[PDB]
Design a protein around this ligand. Structure first.
Ligand SMILES: [Cl-]
Length: 252
């Protein structure tokens, strides 16, 4: 045989490069996944992740209460969370002076949000409804457009010059930063075959039932990077502006 890494007869080499290229290109086909992640950062350094994976379109919608530390995974809060005092905190966030809490500031409120989409999203389709604490997009229902198109604010997460994902990050450092949150994106479709046309619309309806959700709170950004992002070949941007993910297109 020819010698490895010296000719066009390195079939092991050509097959490795096609295997990676096929994964990149399948994800971008109308048969592939589109994915969204919401990360909520708490003052104790822990991070809640909500992930949704689906064909054609994908999104996540959470209340003010559901984004607070210990709502999901309350069994981790035993001796650190006063669940009753946190009910009173909620009454004082819904209406000024409406509750009887024993804290000025709940350490369970998120300090920041990162939204990440898979590289299979079309960024011009991204929509976000960032509501007040009683789930109203813009002050009163009567004057609310139900979303903002925020694609222009998304940064490219890059590895080896390939786009591996898209990031929108915003801090909630002020006492008045009390939010509900929904986000939504559509899978790329550079074709003129509308996946929602009469021929395929019931498959999009089935995609709504088939979407898979994941929810977990990690104790540290390091634990998130090591045991969630890296093992699953997911894109990520850390507090130091360091990019994570795997470049696949035309690569060994
Ligand atoms: Cl296709």
């Amino acid at each position: 045989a020819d010698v490895a890494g010296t000719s066009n007869r390195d079939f092991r080499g050509r097959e490795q490069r096609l295997f990676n290229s096929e994964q990149y290109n399948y994800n971008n086909s109308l048969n592939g996944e589109v994915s969204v992640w919401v990360y909520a950062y708490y003052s104790d350094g822990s991070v809640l992740v909500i992930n949704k994976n689906s064909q054609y379109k994908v999104g996540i919608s959470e209340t003010f209460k559901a984004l607070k530390e210990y709502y999901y995974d309350p069994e981790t809060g035993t001796w650190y969370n006063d669940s009753y005092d946190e009910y009173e905190v909620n009454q004082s966030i819904y209406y000024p002076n409406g509750g009887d809490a024993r804290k000025f500031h709940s350490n369970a409120k998120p300090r920041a949000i990162q939204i990440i989409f898979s590289p299979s999203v079309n960024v011009r389709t991204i929509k976000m409804a960032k509501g007040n604490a009683v789930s109203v997009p813009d002050e009163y229902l009567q004057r609310s457009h139900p979303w903002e198109a925020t694609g222009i604010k998304y940064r490219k997460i890059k590895r080896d010059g390939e786009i591996v994902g898209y990031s929108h990050y915003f801090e909630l450092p002020h006492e008045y930063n009390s939010i509900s949150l929904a986000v939504s994106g559509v899978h790329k479709n550079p074709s003129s075959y509308n996946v929602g046309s009469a021929h395929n619309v019931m498959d999009v309806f089935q995609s709504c039932d088939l979407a898979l959700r994941f929810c977990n709170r990690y104790w540290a950004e390091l634990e998130l990077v090591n045991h969630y992002i890296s093992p699953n070949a997911y894109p990520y941007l850390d507090i130091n502006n360091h990019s994570y993910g795997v470049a696949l297109s035309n690569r060994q």
